[PDB]
Amino acid sequence: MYSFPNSFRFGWSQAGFQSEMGTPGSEDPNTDGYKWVHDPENMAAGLVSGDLPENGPGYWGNYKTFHDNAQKMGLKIARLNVEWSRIFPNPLPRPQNFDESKQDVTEVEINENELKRLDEYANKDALNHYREIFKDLKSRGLYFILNMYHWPLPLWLHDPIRVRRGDFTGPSGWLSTRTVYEFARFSAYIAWKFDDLVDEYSTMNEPNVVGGLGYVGVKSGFPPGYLSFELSRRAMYNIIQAHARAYDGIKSVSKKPVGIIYANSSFQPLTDKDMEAVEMAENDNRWWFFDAIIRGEITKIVRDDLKGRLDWIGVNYYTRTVVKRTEKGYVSLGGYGHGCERNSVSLAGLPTSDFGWEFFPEGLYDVLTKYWNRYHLYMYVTENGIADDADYQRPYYLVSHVYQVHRAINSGADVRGYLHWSLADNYEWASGFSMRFGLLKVDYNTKRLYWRPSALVYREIATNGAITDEIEHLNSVPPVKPLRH
Amino acid sequence: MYSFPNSFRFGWSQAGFQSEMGTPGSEDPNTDGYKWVHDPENMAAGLVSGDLPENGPGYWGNYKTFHDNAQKMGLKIARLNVEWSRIFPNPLPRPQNFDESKQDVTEVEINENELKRLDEYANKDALNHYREIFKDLKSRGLYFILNMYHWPLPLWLHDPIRVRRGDFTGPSGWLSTRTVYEFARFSAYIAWKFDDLVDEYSTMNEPNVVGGLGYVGVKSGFPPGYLSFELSRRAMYNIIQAHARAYDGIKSVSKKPVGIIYANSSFQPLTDKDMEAVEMAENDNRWWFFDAIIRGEITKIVRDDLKGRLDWIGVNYYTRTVVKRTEKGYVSLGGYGHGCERNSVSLAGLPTSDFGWEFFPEGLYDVLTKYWNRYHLYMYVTENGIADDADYQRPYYLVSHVYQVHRAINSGADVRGYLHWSLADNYEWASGFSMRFGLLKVDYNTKRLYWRPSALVYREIATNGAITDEIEHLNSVPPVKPLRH
Numbered sequence: 001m002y003s004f005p006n007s008f009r010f011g012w013s014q015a016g017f018q019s020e021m022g023t024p025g026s027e028d029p030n031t032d033g034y035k036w037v038h039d040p041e042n043m044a045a046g047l048v049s050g051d052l053p054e055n056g057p058g059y060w061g062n063y064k065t066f067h068d069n070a071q072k073m074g075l076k077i078a079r080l081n082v083e084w085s086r087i088f089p090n091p092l093p094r095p096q097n098f099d100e101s102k103q104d105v106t107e108v109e110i111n112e113n114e115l116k117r118l119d120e121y122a123n124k125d126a127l128n129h130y131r132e133i134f135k136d137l138k139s140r141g142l143y144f145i146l147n148m149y150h151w152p153l154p155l156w157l158h159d160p161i162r163v164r165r166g167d168f169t170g171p172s173g174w175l176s177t178r179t180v181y182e183f184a185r186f187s188a189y190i191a192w193k194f195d196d197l198v199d200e201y202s203t204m205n206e207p208n209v210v211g212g213l214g215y216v217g218v219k220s221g222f223p224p225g226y227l228s229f230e231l232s233r234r235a236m237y238n239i240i241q242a243h244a245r246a247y248d249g250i251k252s253v254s255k256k257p258v259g260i261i262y263a264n265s266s267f268q269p270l271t272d273k274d275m276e277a278v279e280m281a282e283n284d285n286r287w288w289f290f291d292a293i294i295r296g297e298i299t300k301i302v303r304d305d306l307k308g309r310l311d312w313i314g315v316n317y318y319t320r321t322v323v324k325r326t327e328k329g330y331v332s333l334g335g336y337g338h339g340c341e342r343n344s345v346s347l348a349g350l351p352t353s354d355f356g357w358e359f360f361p362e363g364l365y366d367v368l369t370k371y372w373n374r375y376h377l378y379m380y381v382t383e384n385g386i387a388d389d390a391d392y393q394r395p396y397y398l399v400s401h402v403y404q405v406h407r408a409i410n411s412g413a414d415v416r417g418y419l420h421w422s423l424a425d426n427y428e429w430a431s432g433f434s435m436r437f438g439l440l441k442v443d444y445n446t447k448r449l450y451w452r453p454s455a456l457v458y459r460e461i462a463t464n465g466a467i468t469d470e471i472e473h474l475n476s477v478p479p480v481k482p483l484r485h
Numbered sequence: 486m487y488s489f490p491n492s493f494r495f496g497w498s499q500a501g502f503q504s505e506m507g508t509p510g511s512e513d514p515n516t517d518g519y520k521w522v523h524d525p526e527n528m529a530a531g532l533v534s535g536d537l538p539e540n541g542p543g544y545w546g547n548y549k550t551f552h553d554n555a556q557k558m559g560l561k562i563a564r565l566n567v568e569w570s571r572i573f574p575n576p577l578p579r580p581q582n583f584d585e586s587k588q589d590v591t592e593v594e595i596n597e598n599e600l601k602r603l604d605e606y607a608n609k610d611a612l613n614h615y616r617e618i619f620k621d622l623k624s625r626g627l628y629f630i631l632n633m634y635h636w637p638l639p640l641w642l643h644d645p646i647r648v649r650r651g652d653f654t655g656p657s658g659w660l661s662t663r664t665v666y667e668f669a670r671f672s673a674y675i676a677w678k679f680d681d682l683v684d685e686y687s688t689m690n691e692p693n694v695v696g697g698l699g700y701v702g703v704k705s706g707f708p709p710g711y712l713s714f715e716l717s718r719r720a721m722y723n724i725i726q727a728h729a730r731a732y733d734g735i736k737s738v739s740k741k742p743v744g745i746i747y748a749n750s751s752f753q754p755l756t757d758k759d760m761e762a763v764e765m766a767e768n769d770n771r772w773w774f775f776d777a778i779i780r781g782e783i784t785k786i787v788r789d790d791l792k793g794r795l796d797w798i799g800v801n802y803y804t805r806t807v808v809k810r811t812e813k814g815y816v817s818l819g820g821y822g823h824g825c826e827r828n829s830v831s832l833a834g835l836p837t838s839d840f841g842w843e844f845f846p847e848g849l850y851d852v853l854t855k856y857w858n859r860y861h862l863y864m865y866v867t868e869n870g871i872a873d874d875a876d877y878q879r880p881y882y883l884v885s886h887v888y889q890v891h892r893a894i895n896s897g898a899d900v901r902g903y904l905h906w907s908l909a910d911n912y913e914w915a916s917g918f919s920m921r922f923g924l925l926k927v928d929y930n931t932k933r934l935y936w937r938p939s940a941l942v943y944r945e946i947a948t949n950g951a952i953t954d955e956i957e958h959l960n961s962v963p964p965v966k967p968l969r970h
């Protein structure tokens with residue numbers, strides 16, 4: 001048996017755009033993401049799947065059924081976000097004493113009168129509905145992490161088709177400090193409205209994906225799909241200071257912990273001669289960002305308005321990345337990690353998911369202990385899961401990664417919970433509905449939820465607070481011989 | 486939801502030779518089967534795997550742990566056998582007024598003095614141990630079906646190496662009416678000793694396999710592996726009258742129901758022009774045997790000493806057999822049913838097990854309703870399961886076959902329980918330990934039992950007496966794209 005601290009919580013994470021829509025009256029047509037996935041040219045290009053989020057799993061209407069099943073599964077923590085677009089579907093007045101040309105945003109003043117004026121423009125129907133959802137959540141005894149931002153922006157801040165086309169005269173998302181300013185005020189406003197229900201806050205989810213896929217990895221179908229190293233850097237600079245200004249904003253109205261959730265990989269050497277390549281990749285993908293919002297270090301200078309703006313770190317982990325040293329520096333290798341064939345085996349002989357992602361639970365121990373030793377900030381595993389409609393690999397994936405969290409705690413790392421991605425199947429961005437990450441399988445015609453066997457395994461873990469003796473054999477690699485390869 | 490009658494019981498079946506040995510002091514070295522699987526020539530030929538049953542799962546010593554897990558899983562019925570060899574490890578005196586040359590055995594007299602004399606030769610340590618096992622079983626509220634015979638014979642009745650070599654001067658198993666006579670007395674003796682613990686009896690398990698694989702399908706590694714159509718028929722004739730004489734024997738000491746357990750396939754037409762081939766195959770594999778022990782019809786004559794010797798039918802079902810009409814008659818086709826590649830797909834595109842057996846749950850409905858319409862005797866599904874160490878297919882296999890029993894009941898068939906093969910992994914005859922049929926995975930080094938996710942699924946079925954809404958999606962074919970093919 002592998003037992004966890006009495007205070008450790010098992011639960012799940014979920015995103016609004018991916019799970020809310022699907023029931024009558026639930027559609028949110030007012031985001032950059034909604035425009036992006038409906039765009040005829042994006043569909044013709046195959047940048048998006050043609051599946052549409054308004055045919056989704058229906059959490060907006062059916063949240064009591066989601067929460068019923070989570071409670072029956074023994075879950076004790078959830079991380080959800082509010083959709084900015086639902087709260088402010090129409091534009092806010094452009095800020096007066098605000099200079100859009102100033103590169104740096106070092107303060108965004110929050111006060112009671114500003115909050116009461118913002119309240120005039122908020123959608124009270126959406127606010128009340130979210131209160132009902134979150135009250136129902138809390139009434140099941142679930143600890144609540146509220147995340148402010150999980151990729152879609154109001155269209156009045158970002159028209160992604162205009163930017164895709166190379167037109168930068170309109171609302172340009174994270175390329176504009178207007179978005180930085182409004183995100184800070186949005187985050188303060190939500191904490192002001194919901195602090196009585198929230199246990200901890202996250203400002204954002206996977207900001208590195210926003211900048212990396214939106215402006216470099218443009219085949220991914222992440223908006224606005226405008227290929228530019230320069231603008232990727234500008235977007236990440238703005239998202240960093242937006243995190244800091246939202247941290248300060250929330251702290252002006254709340255005493256509760258404020259963290260951030262990040263897309264992590266475990267960087268692994270192709271050969272024993274590649275350890276410096278690993279360090280370089282960790283610098284280029286992880287430490288540059290966290291040194292900025294924890295130590296204030298940015299490109300070198302120290303900004304005192306960035307330093308110390310983090311209480312905890314959310315680790316989102318799915319697989320590794322294998323790197324080797326080059327003359328110029330380092331490169332990642334296809335055939336491992338997230339660059340494998342779907343439903344196959346990696347070059348290392350490890351099974352791959354429906355998404356082509358390699359089975360590599362030891363990477364989660366690596367990431368947790370690396371963060372702990374560098375910053376000594378406590379952590380949640382805020383995402384971990386697998387695309388696996390058939391449920392062949394998920395029982396092993398679940399138990400093996402939970403075991404690696406147990407290992408990390410035994411080594412001294414302060415890890416306070418494990419949140420699986422996800423409770424139920426949902427809309428997986430440019431891939432649509434075909435990638436199924438749920439413990440629960442969704443029938444999108446009826447919106448009914450079904451328990452995959454891994455959900456029964458998870459109930460055993462969560463209700464016992466342990467990997468029990470009876471399921472310890474699942475701490476192993478899914479047998480590869482019976483799988484496609 | 487698919488609900489079952491309140492009296493319907495879910496449980497499991499298990500065999501002594503396959504599961505008992507593995508703990509200190511549990512070895513039974515005195516069967517034809519033990520000699521057969523240790524034989525150097527059989528091992529060199531690859532007729533047997535080289536795995537040895539004395540390294541097995543250890544039910545003889547660890548039965549309380551088996552039963553603990555079955556009780557936790559909600560199971561309410563078990564079918565087990567006593568091993569003849571354990572009860573009579575040394576030979577009995579040859580019967581005096583018994584003519585070994587008489588082809589027909591129409592009566593085997595049982596009386597109290599005969600039973601008390603038999604008792605003098607019985608192993609009291611084994612008898613007491615079985616009583617302890619069966620008492621523990623009954624103390625969990627499990628209904629108990631006791632089967633008398635599940636293939637191994639005492640070596641003093643069958644030396645299979647001598648017969649393999651073409652020497653018929655020694656103890657020749659089912660080729661000898663001595664075995665018929667002694668089986669009837671053995672069955673009466675066991676019922677006399679255990680009737681207070683038994684709810685229903687079966688005389689034997691899969692008699693058609695004994696005759697078919699022992700004397701025709703000789704590549705299978707089933708003893709004595711002597712290829713002869715003539716002797717296959719002689720063995721089946723003797724096993725039929727042995728069933729009848731054991732039926733009468735048990736009924737001389739007990740009022741409880743006595744049935745038989747049979748190896749079934751669902752015979753399916755390759756094309757719509759092949760329905761007569763199906764009927765012929767059903768005649769040649771199923772009806773000839775049951776017409777003999779129910780209607781007394783044998784080759785045509787009616788024997789009044791065979792007629793009416795059956796109260797219930799145990800259906801053992803794993804997959805189908807596809808047949809087509811030939812000029813001479815009919816033939817079975819490779820690439821379907823039990824003649825597929827392992828961990829692949831059949832010619833029909835259906836997934837195959839670790840044993841090469843095709844996924845075909847509708848066959849179970851076919852077999853149950855065919856038996857019911859012909860004989861109107863009530864039934865148990867006494868075996869159903871899959872070789873699947875990884876547990877990829879078993880959740881679907883379990884739910885889909887249980888659903889087909891629900892269908893059969895809805896159509897009028899009197900089916901009173903479903904017994905999965907098996908609770909735990911065990912020694913699978915000539916294949917050794919590599920074919921894993923358990924809901925529970927066995928570590929053969931430690932003898933520890935682990936719950937595969939399908940065991941958690943089975944607990945949901947058994948504790949609710951139903952396929953619940955939450956697992957209804959498992960009534961479907963395992964997705965083939967992610968599996969080996």
Ligand SMILES: Fc1ccc2[nH]ccc2c1
Binds near residue numbers: 033034150152153430
């Ligand atoms: F299809 C997609 C992909 C990435 C995204 N980020 C925000 C909305 C959205 C939609």
Ligand SMILES: Fc1ccc2[nH]ccc2c1
Binds near residue numbers: 522707708
């Ligand atoms: F390996 C095997 C195969 C079939 C059998 N039948 C009885 C014992 C035995 C052993």
Ligand SMILES: [Cl-]
Binds near residue numbers: 263285286
């Ligand atoms: Cl990372």
Ligand SMILES: [Cl-]
Binds near residue numbers: 294295374375
């Ligand atoms: Cl630090």
Ligand SMILES: [Cl-]
Binds near residue numbers: 442443444445
């Ligand atoms: Cl669907």
Ligand SMILES: [Cl-]
Binds near residue numbers: 748749750751771
């Ligand atoms: Cl049959």
Ligand SMILES: [Cl-]
Binds near residue numbers: 779780859860
């Ligand atoms: Cl009849």
Ligand SMILES: [Cl-]
Binds near residue numbers: 927929930
């Ligand atoms: Cl083992």
